[PDB]
Ligand binder design. Sequence first.
Ligand SMILES: CCn1cc(NC(=O)C2CCC2)cn1
Lengths: 412, 412
Amino acid sequence: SRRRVVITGMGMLSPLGLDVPSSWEGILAGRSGIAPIEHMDLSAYSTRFGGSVKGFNVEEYLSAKEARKLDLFIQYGLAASFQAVRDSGLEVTDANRERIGVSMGSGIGGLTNIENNCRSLFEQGPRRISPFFVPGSIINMVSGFLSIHLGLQGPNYALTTAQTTGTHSIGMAARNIAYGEADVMVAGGSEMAACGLGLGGFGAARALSTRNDEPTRASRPWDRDRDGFVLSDGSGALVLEELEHARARGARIYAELVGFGMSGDAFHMTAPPEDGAGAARCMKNALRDAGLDPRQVDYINAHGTSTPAGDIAEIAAVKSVFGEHAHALSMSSTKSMTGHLLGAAGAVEAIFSVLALRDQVAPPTINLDNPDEGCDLDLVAHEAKPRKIDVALSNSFGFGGTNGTLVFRRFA
Amino acid sequence: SRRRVVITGMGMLSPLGLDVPSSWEGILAGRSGIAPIEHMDLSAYSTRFGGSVKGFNVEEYLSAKEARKLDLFIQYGLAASFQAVRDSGLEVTDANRERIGVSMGSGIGGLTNIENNCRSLFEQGPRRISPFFVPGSIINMVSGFLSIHLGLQGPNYALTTAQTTGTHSIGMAARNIAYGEADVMVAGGSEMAACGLGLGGFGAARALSTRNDEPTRASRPWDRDRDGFVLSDGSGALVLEELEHARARGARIYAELVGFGMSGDAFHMTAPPEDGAGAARCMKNALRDAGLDPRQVDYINAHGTSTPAGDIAEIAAVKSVFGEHAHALSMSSTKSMTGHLLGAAGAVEAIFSVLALRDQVAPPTINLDNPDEGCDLDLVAHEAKPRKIDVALSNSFGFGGTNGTLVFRRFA
Ligand SMILES: CCn1cc(NC(=O)C2CCC2)cn1
């Protein structure tokens, strides 16, 4: 047997806003957070734009001195985590601190810090490298710093599954609670890969949109004129909680997390199979885990990265899994607005999936001006669609053919 | 309901050998793998030695075409994974490929590749960053590449929990099998952090031994003259398999994985608490998970980093958990010989713990010339000790106060 898991707290930094409600207001208005990247010379680069977090004040969370020790991706993950825990109303005590853990991940981790410490090393030598270089750059330090700050003594770990990180982080945290290893987990992901290395690295692979002239139109999932993904920064964190634990303290419950699927494509290092066999296996695994028929799914938050092969693989996967229900569900890519937060994508998209349930509205896929060949599903083109949503899926597909699917259900 | 998990295959690169048997012969003979580093000029560094993998031939494992794309930490993790899968005798088929997954992690990942690409970026511009920069550096690509080349379609993920990574990776992979999410997992870790940023960043924290003039004596866990950890490179991988699956195919079973614990110190970003409270909580969780009397523990493969505070915290934790039985068990640090493989430490030490069970011998803590105040347990000083071992425990502790413990026992 298995315990039930609900969402009692959410937190976010995104290109749309410095918290959940501002981000979500942008999402339902079809607003783009994409813009040319500032305070950075990108002349030599084929991509000059992305989704930056705008106006982030780390001193709302940390002293300047503790903030100086940490890469931006860690600052962003801590901000989302602190928001989520505050939003949950949870009181940590000696009676429960061993039952409260953290799993906040990242796909790429501390590139900005690595870049700045490379500058020191090359020019001046190793004696200029910061003493906090390692602990301030390693991916497990969101989980680490959060546990130390809040006194959390439960399971403490971090996933790194590239663009699947946030989805796997939340799913494996839900398993920890379901199987009695924890009663509460803070789970999600964070990313800040807008350094030369991030834009240069994805740029060297020709993976990014190069629509420098119209950055807000660059992320156009399933549109025939798409030319790759848009790199974005930020963080998402959820408070996952055992149902009886949440009820006993009178928690506000957003939604129930009923299913989690994982699969490997075993296909290609960076490309998904054109038929989306791996994504179909992963969604079937998640629905089986939830004890739900494909027909019960109402809303899918796609991975929908705006890459040629990825977007078409997801259409094929949804048609394969859902058959005669494939057109009845609504599927949208919020990456059309936020761009691709890499390891944080799954985290912010799980939050948008939960709010789709709260508000009974499918967020839009903006920029979907000319659907590509066979992209004929309800992709919620251009504008939000109020509709019935009892069951919402959130899919992530990443490098190494790593797949994750979360299934959320309305709670009443 | 919870299934039993056995070890059917093991694989390793270490500073003592290019496979498990060669490494283990070095362990039982008290041999040091530590020597001045040859691959780069460290005259400006305060530490100029570590545990290198000597004479690694990537063309035993990978085409020159695949190998050139991948950071050394990925090559090492693939070498160990391939060894472990071959050692297991498992045949991958259409009938079982969806039930076989991988969880190979790293603490730091592709720091050499990222450094070298940062050098190209700063000197030559973004168009000289490798197209393989991202997939060839990010931590999840051991799991990814292994899945692509063996056709593993089970759970595909990667942990990054600093010096706890290998232990967490193996434990969580065992839970996947226990709970029915997979029947087989390849799990462990790999590390190659011996670049300027690695040695420079740990050096900036004054965390490394600076015994440059006697490298083989630098790693001296619980010795009063210890002055920090020794940085080492390599990989460990285990094939974990559900018991009845292993029995059904007539697998050779090395041992059973009976217990896994995790805990967070919630104390300090890098420092372990002096009393080892988090390590004690972690071990108690693992022993309760294994349904054991603590008196059943015969051998402990310590974390044993050769740091002043870490080594004494572990003594305090073992005394607190085992009481009078702390005086009857044997505890040793194989890091005395291998140095600290960081995210791979828990993986090679899990293999050493299984071989302690196979061969009924406690590996030595070499260099333990003068045990420090309170270090009065059986620490197997200097020479391997043949003894009865029914139950072996492997401990890891890392930055962020993250703790893992694995419990293995003989299988008959
Ligand atoms: C992918 C090719 N491959 C090569 C190995 N080699 C070994 O297992 C031996 C070398 C030490 C033990 C396994 N797979």
